[PDB]
Amino acid sequence: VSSLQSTELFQQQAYINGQWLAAQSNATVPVSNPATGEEIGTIPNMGAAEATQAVEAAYTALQSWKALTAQNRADILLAWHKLVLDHTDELALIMTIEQGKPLAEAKGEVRYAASFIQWFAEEGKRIYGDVIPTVNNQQRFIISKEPVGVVAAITPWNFPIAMITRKAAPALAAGCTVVIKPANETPYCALAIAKLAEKAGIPAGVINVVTGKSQEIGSVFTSHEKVKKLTFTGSTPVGRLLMQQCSSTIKKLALELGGNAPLIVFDDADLDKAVQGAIFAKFRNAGQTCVCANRIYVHDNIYQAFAEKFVQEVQKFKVGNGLEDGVQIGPLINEKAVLKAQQLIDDAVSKGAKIACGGKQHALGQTFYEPSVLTNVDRTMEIVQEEIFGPVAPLIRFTDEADVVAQANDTIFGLAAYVYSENISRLWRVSEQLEYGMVGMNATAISNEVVPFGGVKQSGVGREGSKYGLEEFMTIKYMCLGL
Amino acid sequence: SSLQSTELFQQQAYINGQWLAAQSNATVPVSNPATGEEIGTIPNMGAAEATQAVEAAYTALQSWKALTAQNRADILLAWHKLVLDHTDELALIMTIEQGKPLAEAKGEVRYAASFIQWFAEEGKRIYGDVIPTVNNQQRFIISKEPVGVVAAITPWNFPIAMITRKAAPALAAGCTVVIKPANETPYCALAIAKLAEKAGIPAGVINVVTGKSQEIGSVFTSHEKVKKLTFTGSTPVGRLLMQQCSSTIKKLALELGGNAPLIVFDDADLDKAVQGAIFAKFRNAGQTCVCANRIYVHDNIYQAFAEKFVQEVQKFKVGNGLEDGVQIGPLINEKAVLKAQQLIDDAVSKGAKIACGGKQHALGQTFYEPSVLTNVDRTMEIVQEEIFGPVAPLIRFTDEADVVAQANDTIFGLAAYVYSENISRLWRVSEQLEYGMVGMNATAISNEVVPFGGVKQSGVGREGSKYGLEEFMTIKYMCLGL
Amino acid sequence: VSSLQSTELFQQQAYINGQWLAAQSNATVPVSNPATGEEIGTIPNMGAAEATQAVEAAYTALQSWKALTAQNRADILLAWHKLVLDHTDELALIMTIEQGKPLAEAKGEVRYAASFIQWFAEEGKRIYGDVIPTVNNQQRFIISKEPVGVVAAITPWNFPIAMITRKAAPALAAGCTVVIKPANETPYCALAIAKLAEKAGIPAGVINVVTGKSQEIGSVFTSHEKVKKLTFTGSTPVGRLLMQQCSSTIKKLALELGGNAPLIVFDDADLDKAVQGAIFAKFRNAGQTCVCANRIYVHDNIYQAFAEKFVQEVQKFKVGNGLEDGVQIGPLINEKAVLKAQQLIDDAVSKGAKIACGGKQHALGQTFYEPSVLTNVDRTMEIVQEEIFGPVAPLIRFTDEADVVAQANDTIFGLAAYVYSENISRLWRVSEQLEYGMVGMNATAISNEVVPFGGVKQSGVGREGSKYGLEEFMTIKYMCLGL
Amino acid sequence: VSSLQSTELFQQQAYINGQWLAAQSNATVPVSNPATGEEIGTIPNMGAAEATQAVEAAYTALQSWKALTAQNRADILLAWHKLVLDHTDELALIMTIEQGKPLAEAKGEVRYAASFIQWFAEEGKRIYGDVIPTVNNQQRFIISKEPVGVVAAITPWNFPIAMITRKAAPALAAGCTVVIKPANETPYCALAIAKLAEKAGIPAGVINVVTGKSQEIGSVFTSHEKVKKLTFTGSTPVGRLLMQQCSSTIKKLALELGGNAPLIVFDDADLDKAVQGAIFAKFRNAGQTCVCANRIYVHDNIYQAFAEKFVQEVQKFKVGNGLEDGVQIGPLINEKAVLKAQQLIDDAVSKGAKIACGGKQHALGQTFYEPSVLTNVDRTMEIVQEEIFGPVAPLIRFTDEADVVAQANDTIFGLAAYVYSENISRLWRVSEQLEYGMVGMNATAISNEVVPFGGVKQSGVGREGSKYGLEEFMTIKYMCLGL
């Protein structure tokens, strides 16, 4: 687009050791706008050779980056933070064009992403060691924290800026250097963040972005001896594989994988509050989010009222290009996601589910899918066991509390959940019984930089943001001082 | 008869509060490494029994984690008391099946008991957080919850401490545990389970499955209900177990190999370094993950250090662990003797001298002579491989940056030791050593209050200390909307 | 009372430097059973001289007591803990006879008191210091914790055992030594605990109990150069004085003073739960507790129903000697308390308050007072501005939320408060607005050893029990290591 | 002077509730340049009436200041931080003229003072509560932290900017409001900081500066019911009085009082390192610091060598006006300090001490004192028991380790101490035996914003800066939630 070429942050080259490079073979692959299908540019189709160069550059830069004081790195990171916020409109324009979400959501993500840079710039000055009461009066126990080393980050496409800073910021603040493999569907967001890193004074090699062959690059990131940690956000099948490859060198892991988030609305809940909350938890980013409400359980006594209000809100949605005014629902990332959504809806309907609205591709074509609502859904339908990653809201009837809790936990995942109830005992009892890493209690806007973000079970390991985020990128050194 | 007279000697496995044989009635013999005699047998269980233990642990998990932290602390402390009260009986079992001297066995029992007491107290202190809100309509309340069923696979070098170091923090966290101990030293694990039964630990909360390692380990690392694996052993096995745990994204705790370096600079307290290097090298006959594998000594004190060192080694009394004053027991098996002889032969063929020892001991069996090698350098295999034996390779060096590079020239990073009376050098070198634990003018670094673990391919996670219990917990972020 | 002479723990001499001593003047003051009026024994009437001997002994014992390891002190403190529980019946007997509370409550306090010994024996091993990320690469910042030194503890009569352990246990666990001045009304509990310390192997001088002249003993405790901290629990006027005397040497302070605890019952509260909870908060220890509900605010829409059910429960109480079976309300500590209770009720009645039940001395005479309930109370009555410290429940009517919150905070105190409401927003809103250090939310049984016990404003400073209790007795040492 | 009339930060009026006011009586007191004696200007001589207005203004502004989010206050405080640094040269100019220290030191203090604003702006976002494991499965223990309320700060003259931020920054970041009474010798530094607070958008009443009658203003700060915490830095006798006045209302206390800092140089020390460190510890701010080396103990085996080198460095000092190039020693704050310094030198000389250099007023007159060095000092001299607060270095001979430690601790104070030794055992043994809150170990530049600054014994209570500085301005609230 001409609107892309007018920004200094639109880069069609990779970023390795402070240089803007093409692949050694000069090959390139195209990037497309999911709302129009047109090609917006190309990126280098790099592979193992270039990925190794990045690791080597990150390792060399590691020695002098960790030697700086915490305040040295904090000042640089804050300059990075300032640049990200000053270029909010331009970063959002890139995101909407290559990823498809509305411009308002893209700007929100930019601010959400920038807050992690500021947060961890401050954490770096506060990663405290310990002094442990000795069991032997001739020894003193002094515990310190040190960076793991070179970090490998593999990021997805649904949040093409926040998933970068959520991994790069804590890594850098910890004294680590990072090599990044971004999704080929949304690479320009990562490269734009790297361009601002250059302007912020982040030395060469501390942050590297390698685009192209995912398997070849990922293979090097998960095997190279100098990569000490792998942080990955994406599907669970890919997570199983990456962790498998990391086994040969015992690499530290940080995984944020799939999520089948249940949203439970009891009959004693604030009905209007639960509806607006469920609307937000379901249709944000067109439902293409790991913490999106994949199952909405509603009690029998309010099922009819809830469904009617819920459908009324869904029918107000404006679907179209993310650059249009007032647009709320963008297109799905690719055709496979459309096919997955149509299958799960067809399966549900074949088992008695009704379509309250939507249920087919949108008139705009491309990968646009109609915002949909299903009623009469039960546990025998595949849409209860699989992630939709689309704007499809299955409303599941229930009555007994012990039964809905069992259904909510009847999944390999355990990322985010949501409970709506004005009864204090029920609210706490259910939140504690839910086997999830995050539980919204009469709230669904749970995302921010100060709370520990992550899941349990097969939703992954580790936490991003919060006081717990920085320790993920550090190791413990126990000094036994003999006096 | 010495162990038949012990109520703690058990030749059956422990699953869901029952003393079971294998479904096939198959058993495997256990031998005394100092004499060669067969002590008894243990069930040779497989995948079926391993699955029964996982199921039993999951059923017991619901009511075990429902108790209060103080309820569990009381039960754990009764377990702690019984362990210390049966120190002599436990040490007798360990020495007979493992080989180490009776004095070392008693020390491990107390060391091991301290973990039960430590984590009984930690269970009452798994603090959550209240985080300052970014939105005045919400409150951020963070809590900690048990991961669930834990699978523990333990080695033979510390057959009791490696059990409590994993089972104690798991139980204190509200978890239940299934344990696969080493077939060379199973009776120590079964004796600890018999005490657990006497301490009132409910059925299924702790289970010990003996026999086929590959079959039992395959179930532990794949069964959907097992949420965490904690393993201590060789790195190649750790790689395999981590790989198998990948299909269900299991949480990991790994304590693997360790090629521990010990550096003695010329400004060190010479006598203090010698006594420290002796302790770090010859404890448990050198069969320890944190044992001094490489002993770097500066050129200006190399000769003096080697002389004093050899003098101490030649005082060692080698023999049966039950004899008075015995300090060096036998190696665990014949493979260890062959490895040690191969590594010494390679070093000698490249210029190394044998200051003492260097061959099997006159007592036969798996006894190996306490040995000291001089003129060792980095081209020898003994510097790149773990000996797990009473062999001390003394390596000469001069430059500080060079010995630091040699110390880090390894895939491991468990324990390291530095001796120097210069404050700035002691801190500079310790901070440059890529290890999870660094002894600074000290080598007796083991205890229950310090975080025990390594970096790089020496593994992940920590045992003991304030950090040991969070390994068995998950974080729950509650966003309360007002 | 020969039941006292038959226990090894009944001691009529003070405890200083491991010896059982009388006053240098051989002067004694009698102790009485408040339920019967009999003399049960005497205690030494010591003054400044003996108090100075205890401080000197504590300072000498401090050198070797703080040199031990945390595990060494833990073993000794746990032996002390074991002995306290093993002698629960004997300690409860002594308390009931000299203090008056029922034998069941006394046994509860002994177990409550014992838990502090166990808790802080464990805390002593965990007074972690810090390693702070340096701002100058040539220095390292290592923070450690050290005992403050000799501690002075002045305790009241309402909880004559728990108040001792709540101060002596953390002091000893921190590496400190303690000199104790217990209330002359209930000294045998303090001396009994000291006799068990001797049996537990606590070295001589580590714990000392000085009985007699409060002004003379307290003057030494608050001025001797070697006393580095004062921990006091009692009346606010005395607290002001002790703190003032502590000024000349800048002594560290721990004060738990008065508390005009309010208990608010909104109309959306579980009525039955609030009644039982308010009954417990008011009549425990016959109302003679710092956290007892002094003001019971009840909303207009449930005032009549709450009052009726509350009075029904109060009329079931059995009043009498604490040793009898099923006794729930004992006698007040002394005649002054009966006077003050009667005066406050008379003032309230003269301004429109009605006596629903009680309102005069009990038929048993002595210092027994009838469990009473007042209705139609308002803020103009003195019973709302003064602690009654007795079994009298003033039920105050309110309607507006902002007003009842203003009334609850309209006091110089800020120790404990209680709020009953099934509305989540109201419960948090009010609890956060109440200027108190402790707020029970749909609960009144708030006392235990793991939670931080203390107040704000003129209710005092510092906390007892919990992770925060041991730091009170430690100082910080910042080591700046230059490399 | 006209150089002050040319900066917008030179204010000759007080700052109360966002207004620039004169005293109700219009009375004024003069401020003088100690280097020239000239009158620089006047400040309002306010009293109790105006101090009460400030408290009322701080209490009113408190309600809305604490209702903001931690990030809200962080943004405002960081704007304040940016302004302080942007106006470094102007702030340093004011300090050098009214306080006397060299312009280079003043600029250093500005940066030092600014770092506390940044540090606590970040701490405000990290004042974490707790969730304690329950002892009763029907309750949940949620611990939160709340601001103590209006804070009263009384600051000295030796660091007329850093002492302001070291108290106002954590107070504001905690959600508190502050009223400040600065030293009449250096008021313009405090008012200039207030002018920058106004520009930074800090609302009216959140920060107030009352100048004039110290006792009258201090009496209101230490007695008004709404002042909940006093933080004071100054002389121990004044601290004793302020604490005594705070007793009537049980106000929370933070005190940083006197400090008879010993510096011990053993014979196994890096001689040159110990000399340069002793020079820095002694003559920074012309020796007018609470942590300045008041006693310099030097082992007998290196006493002659240490002295010769020490006097060599002292004789290189350039004494003169703080605005002149290369000046390193400025004038003392007033004439009383010159007299006290001469008295302590006379007493030492009368008991055998030798003057190696200096020992009298400087040729420049005014309050300039010659940088002096005394040898042959011993414990019987007054200079060893009294703070000299001047450029006078008493070198004290010693031999035995146990003796020099006993001499170091033979004081009521316990603020800062320094030890130089290349023996690891001795360095740790001695540092652990020194009853001080801060110990430099082969280092004397111990001051920075991330380390806990404070003393033990009669040197005061509490800590400033570091992870421990913010809790001093918070209270703990224990919520016992009943399910």
Residue numbers in the entry:
A (entry chain A), C (entry chain B), D (entry chain D): 1 to 483
B (entry chain C): 2 to 483
Copied sentences from the primary study:
Acinetobacter baumannii is an opportunistic human pathogen which can use host-derived L-carnitine as sole carbon and energy source. Using recombinantly purified enzymes, enantiomer-specific formation of D-malate by the NAD(P)+-dependent malic semialdehyde dehydrogenase (MSA-DH) is demonstrated. Based on these findings, it was concluded that A. baumannii MSA-DH catalyzes the stereospecific formation of D-malate which might be further metabolized as part of the degradation pathway.
The asymmetric unit contains an overall of three individual MSA-DH homotetramers which is consistent with our gel filtration and mass photometry experiments. Every monomer possesses two funel-like invaginations which were proposed as potential entry sites for the MSA substrate and the cofactor NAD(P)+, respectively. Starting from opposite sides, both channels meet in a region where the two highly conserved amino acids Cys290 and Glu256 are localised. The respective amino acid of MSA-DH was identified as Asn184. Accordingly, a relaxed NAD(P)+ cofactor specificity was expected on the basis of the solved MSA-DH structure. The obtained active site model was further substantiated as amino acid residues Arg166, Arg284 and Ser447 were located at an appropriate distance for hydrogen bonding interaction with the carboxylate group of the substrate. The solved crystal structure places the active site loop in a conformation which closely resembles the reduced `active state` of human succinic semialdehyde dehydrogenase.
